[PDB]
Amino acid sequence: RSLLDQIFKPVLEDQVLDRVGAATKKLARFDIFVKEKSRLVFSAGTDFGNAEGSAYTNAVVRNIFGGAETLTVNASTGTRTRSAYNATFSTPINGNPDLRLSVEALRSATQKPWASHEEHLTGANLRLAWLTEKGDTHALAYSSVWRQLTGLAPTASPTVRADAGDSLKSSLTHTFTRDRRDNPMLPQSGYLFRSVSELAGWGPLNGDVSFAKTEVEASGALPVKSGVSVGGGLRLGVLYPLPLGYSLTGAAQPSRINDRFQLGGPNDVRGFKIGGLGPHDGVDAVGGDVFAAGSVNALLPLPRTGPDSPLRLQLYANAGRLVALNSKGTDEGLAMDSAAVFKGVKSAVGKLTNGIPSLAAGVGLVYAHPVARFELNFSLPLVLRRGEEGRKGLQVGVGISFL
């Protein structure tokens, strides 16, 4: 009762005034809906009968003490070890549904075809999903994971054969969002902004890897109700190695293939293979440290029809430049002092400025579904750095984040 009393009293304490709409939004934020939302759910798609049991499972618990929630998934297939831990938890914190908290203990096998290997995560994390009143979101995290690489089946590389061990990566991120977008899937006249800056191993945050990854974003839109809706886009990113103990100068072990940016595909830069635009090694796509991006868009509305059902046109011209961090300086297995790595990135960013990076181009057919965004484009990569695996056919794009 007090859960709602604490928000009723600020309304009750005061021609006529309409301050109750904010209370209604507060109520709706709890994901507990005034009739009901639901109670628990379930499923067990339990196959059987052979060397595989396939042991499906699911669960939701939409309340425990009044506002706390849980979840669970599983697939004890009998071929994969398990995904038996994908359980979560949620609870507001001392009064409001904004300052959420959470705990998860994930375990999965994130298969990667573009780099011919696999990953075996067995970690757990802890979030704090504070949503500021104006729409600006925040977050935190602390995700000690295990991050094993064991899928080197075909001829992969002599690079992805140097990264097959393990790691801890006790990270601590900090998300952000300033979403003024008019339609989350179809940016027509809105806005955007993000930041995902995490500090992986340093001082108290222990483990083995050590860096500070700093990914930024931007967006735009400007219809000059003719849905002309000129587009936009921009991204950035930096992967700066760091020492391991409570300092800023000293040893610094360079990046692995688990922590580097990969820039390409139907979701980030249209007109390239799912992983392209990188310091490629033969056939295998090794990621680079520093990178940038870009885009321009048109999103023409179907003429002689009007601002009807979401479907529109699209005329994009992407970009992208994912360099890697070389040293080529002061020539000890892997130990670069702060002076060297600094003069590495400082020079490994000059390669970003010079040169026409890359330029896809084409047309597409957007279908701004409420929950997703289907693209089905067709593009033609103009400029390329040798061995980046351009693509030219039908560029089937599906997801939530695009450029």
């Binding site: 295990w146 690489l149 140097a162 580097r260 070389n326 040169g355």
Partner: protein
Amino acid sequence: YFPLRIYEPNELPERSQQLTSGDLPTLYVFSTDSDARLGLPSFNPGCLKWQTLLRLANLDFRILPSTNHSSPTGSLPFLLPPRTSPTASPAPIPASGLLSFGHLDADLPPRAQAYLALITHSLRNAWLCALYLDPTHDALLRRLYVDPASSSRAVRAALLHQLRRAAAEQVAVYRSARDALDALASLLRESETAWFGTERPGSFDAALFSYTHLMVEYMSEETGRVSLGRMVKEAGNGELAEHRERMLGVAWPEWDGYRR
């Protein structure tokens, strides 16, 4: 057809620039980076065998520690040819093709075929038990297979267990190893050619050196059940001891540091 320009492939990152470029073929073995610079022998016998073989074939190379996931097959000791194109590399060579890359792998009389089954199937077990199962040697297994793995006590307990379990099922036995080293000691006392029948040591001497050496270096701890470090030097009249020293004057004729 359309892509307009071509712009000088993009300079592989610092890790692979430092590790896997090389000039000579970089054999991968189980080892600690302290020995990698010095080319000293490995600590896993299933790889020291091939390493001793190659270095008998007078082929030069650089050892480079790895982690047994990075391998074309499950087993580790695979060799990589040098880098000929800074963006494209040759194919790996598994353990089966190193000595393809004469007298070493030659047919032997069936007697010499027999005793080799003793070493592969009996001495191998006494190694696992004395290392992966005997709790007194929970210290040395740590400094070798888990300590340079991840360095986080939350993780080490996982790998240390994953090994012991997956190694216990693959194997009391201490007696079967006792008499076995007296058998080979007799096979040596009847050769009179400083090796097991041949003037230049072949695949059998190297297969035995794979165990006669490690058990001397890492298992000679005196604290019943006399450790295998003494059995190797006490079997017969010590003919297994002197064999290694006569062997460790050809493969590495310039290194000292044996004998604990």
